[PDB]
Write a protein that binds this DNA or RNA. Structure first.
Length: 357
DNA sequence: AAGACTTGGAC
DNA sequence: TGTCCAGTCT
């Protein structure tokens, strides 16, 4: 069992920060800084501690914003950890809102030592159009860290940050940023593009599908981004997504018994596949349940049935029992559960069962 | 496999 | 308010 993550900002590390700060700034009020930062340290969460380091430095350094930035630039390469150095972008977000230009410059430099993904989002919150333009430039920088910030900082649903409602509502705003990055060599950037697109599929699935259906997947970097961008839709058995990742059959007697169950009971899916081809076919056969979720909407999950060869004009009966019970990773909600049968990524039929209260 | 499991924050 | 994140494990 690992130590809680707030212990990254423990007193040892505060002392490390004050030591390095004194090396960069001999007149540094190290004692005042440690006193400020330790007050109530125990009851502070990990992100509260990152902020405290920034506030404690600001409270004891008697220099102005540019002069402090000079010391902070020298401090950055001396910190052990990229996580620890989140307080440097945080410092910009706290104290750089009167000097936009210098702040952008400072974020662009600080992000290479850790990440300005959290700090840029305050600027996107309260100064969106100006900040978005900076990022569009950052998406064409030579530094993969800067390019990555362009993608990561503007995500609709960044973990450990508030959602960007403006971005979440309109995927056209950040579209050109992602377009400039859709063939990036950097794995670090490519993850960010994909995770950003994944976020978009939570609210504009059809928009993402069309974008990627316009892409040249001959390019391996682009292909990588597409697979991981579409990963949620894939797991839902989205037909268009499955086509993007890569059958002469008919189906008989598709059914789900019983038609109504209580939680804890079993269902049984069955059908017969028949080939209409003159030669054997490699088939991948899956099914998806539109599970009823908290909202009362459906969210589809795909299970594997069978991957096999069906001879010319042949038949294969398929049967699967599933135990419908609440588990650690899935809670069930009552209502109508549609069940689709997929053959080679195409929906071939649907049945349903009802799960009651 | 499909599910258990991993930080802890947002919703 | 269980799920997700972004995978590792069986």
């Amino acid at each position: 069992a690992a130590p809680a993550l707030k212990e990254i900002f423990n007193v040892e590390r505060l002392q490390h920060i004050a030591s390095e700060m004194t090396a960069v700034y001999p007149a540094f009020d190290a004692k005042g800084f440690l006193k400020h930062a330790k007050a109530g340290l125990a009851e502070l969460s990990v992100m509260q501690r990152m902020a405290r380091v920034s506030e404690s430095l600001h409270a004891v350094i008697p220099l102005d914003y540019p002069q402090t930035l000079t010391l902070l630039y020298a401090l950055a390469p001396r910190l052990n950890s990229g996580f620890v150095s989140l307080f440097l972008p945080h410092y910009v977000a706290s104290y750089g809102r009167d000097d936009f230009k210098r702040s952008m410059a400072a974020l662009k430099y600080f992000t290479t030592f850790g990440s300005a993904e959290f700090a840029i989002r305050h600027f996107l919150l309260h100064d969106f159009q100006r900040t978005l333009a900076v990022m569009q430039a950052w998406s064409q920088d030579d530094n993969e860290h800067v390019r990555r910030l362009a993608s990561e900082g503007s995500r609709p649903r960044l973990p450990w940050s508030f959602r960007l409602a403006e971005v979440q509502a309109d995927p056209e705003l950040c579209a050109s940023i992602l377009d400039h990055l859709k063939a990036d060599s950097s794995l670090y950037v490519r993850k960010s593009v994909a995770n950003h697109l994944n976020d978009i599929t939570k609210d504009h699935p059809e928009w993402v599908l069309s974008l990627i259906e316009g892409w040249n997947l001959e390019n391996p970097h682009t292909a990588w981004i597409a697979r991981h961008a579409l990963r949620s839709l894939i797991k839902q058995g989205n037909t268009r997504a499955l086509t993007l990742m890569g059958a002469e059959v008919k189906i008989h007697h598709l059914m789900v018994t019983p038609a109504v169950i209580n939680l804890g009971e079993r269902i049984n899916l069955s059908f017969t596949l028949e080939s209409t081809a003159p030669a054997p076919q490699k088939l991948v056969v899956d099914y998806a349940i539109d599970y009823v979720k908290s909202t009362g909407h459906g969210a589809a999950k795909v299970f594997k049935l069978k991957a096999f060869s069906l001879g010319a004009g042949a038949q294969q009966h398929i049967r699967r029992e599933q135990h419908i019970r609440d588990m650690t990773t899935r809670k069930h909600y009552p209502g109508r559960h549609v069940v689709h049968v997929l053959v080679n990524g195409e929906r071939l039929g649907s049945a349903e069962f009802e799960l009651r209260a």
